[PDB]
Amino acid sequence: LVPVYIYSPEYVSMCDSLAKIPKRASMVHSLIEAYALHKQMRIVKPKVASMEEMATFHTDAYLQHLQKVSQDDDHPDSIEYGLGYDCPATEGIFDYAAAIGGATITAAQCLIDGMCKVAINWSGGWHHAKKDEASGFCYLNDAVLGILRLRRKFERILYVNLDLHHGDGVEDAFSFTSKVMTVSLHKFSPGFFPGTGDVSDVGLGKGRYYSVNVPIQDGIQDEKYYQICESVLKEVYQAFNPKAVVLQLGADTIAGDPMCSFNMTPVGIGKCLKYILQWQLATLILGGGGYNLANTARCWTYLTGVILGKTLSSEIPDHEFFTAYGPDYVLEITPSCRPDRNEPHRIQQILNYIKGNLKHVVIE
Ligand SMILES: CN(C)c1ccc(C(=O)NCCCCCCC(=O)NO)cc1
Ligand SMILES: [K+]
Ligand SMILES: [Zn+2]
Known part of the structure; x- marks a missing residue:
């Protein structure tokens, strides 16, 4: 059955006002639309998350504060709740947060209801937010909210983070439970955000x-x-x-x-995505970081093509943001001539560590 595509003109407009990634949502959607991919998908207007739905993970104190400043970048309680340079108390930020949370929840609900096997919210994936603090451009953890909705039906949920940054907010939220397994491939280097997620981090307690x-x-x-x-x-x-x-x-x-x-290029990520899709499980697709806006659109458009099993033209079709795609105007991305700093011995060691750890899971 056909993939769900979480989309509405209002949703994109709201996502567009995120101060760190202005217009990214529009560029991603308009490229997908320019490749006519939306016609092969079931378009679903996202619901706005309610206070109650948001509070399934976030504290009432933090949410009430976010609501207050959203109507204010100089409040004395904002530092405690992680609001600062990375997460400025922009006006309307609570509505933008509720929209993204609601979008991922809507995606999850579609999966629960058997409407689809794959549901896409490219504007979601704000995996750093904690129950009571904003972090890393994230004011609300929609990935956690999405997982909590899936928990209505599924007793074993796998979260896979393929982003440059460790999905610390999600991992932390489920650190003590065995119903949700988190897997994160990310850059880990002293001083690089958020600083967590070594191979030795394996969760706590149960x-x-x-x-x-x-x-x-x-x-x-x-x-x-x-x-x-x-x-x-x-x-x-x-x-x-x-x-x-x-x-x-x-x-x-x-x-x-x-x-x-x-x-990386989108083709490489695509292979990982293909490997996961062939499990044929209910799969909630989210975005994440992406700070070259045209490339982010190239990437998520190509990956949408993978989900649909469609081969796209290399030539970027004319659309609202065509000029952003110069000077080559093609879909493919070329790797930089930079060295790979990953020692094959270290990779193997990490993998063997992980296999060791999962042995304990198997024997349980
Ligand atoms: C050029 N400029 C103004 C900035 C450049 C980098 C950061 C930053 O890395 N900040 C640390 C927070 C990074 C959060 C990344 C969100 C993400 O992609 N998570 O996967 C900040 C400002
Ligand atoms: K866990
Ligand atoms: Zn990232």
Whole structure:
């Protein structure tokens, strides 16, 4: 059955007002629309998240504060709740947060109701927010909210974070439970945000070994990334037997991102995505980071094509943002001539560590 595409003109307009990524949502949607991919999808208007739905993870104190300042960047309680340079108390930020949370919840509900096997919210994936604090441009953790909605039907949910940054907010939220396993492939290097997610972080208490982290260094390309991803997910699948998947596909790993860390292309990420889709589980697709706006659109458009199993023309079709795609005006991204800093011995060590940990899961 046909993938659900979480979309409304209002939703994109709201997502467009996010101060760190202005107009990104429109560029992503308009490229998908320019490739006519939306015609092959079921378009679903997202619901706005209610106070009660948001409070299934976030505290009432934090949410009431967010609501207050959304109507104010100099409040004395904002520092406590993580509001600052990374998460400015922009006017309307509570509405933008409620829209993105509601969108991912709507995606989850569609999956629960058997409307689709795959549901897409490219504007979601704000995985750093904590129950009571904003963090890393994230004011509300829609990925956690999405997982909590899926928990209505699924007893084993797998969260997979393929983003440059560790999905710390999500991992933390489920650190003590075994119903949700988190798997994160991300850059791990002292001083690099958020600073967590070493391979030794495996969760706590009853959630011990139900958090998986794959610390990766600068320069990694498609082939090695896919090998790492396939070997981990093969072990996770056999060990954990997930019944639903929440997959975050950040674009901030792609060559050309100004963070200039990993050296991936959308084709490489696509392979990881294909590996997960062939499990044929209810899958909630989210975006994430992506700071080269045109490349982020290239990436999520291509990946939408993968979900649909469609091969797209390399030539960017004319559309509202055509000029943003110069000077080559093509869909494909070329890797930078930068060294891969990932030692094959270190990769193997990490993978063996992880296999060791998942052995404990299997024997349980
Ligand atoms: C050029 N400029 C003004 C900035 C550049 C980088 C950051 C930053 O990395 N901040 C730390 C927070 C990064 C959050 C990343 C969100 C994400 O992609 N998560 O996956 C801030 C400002
Ligand atoms: K867990
Ligand atoms: Zn990121």
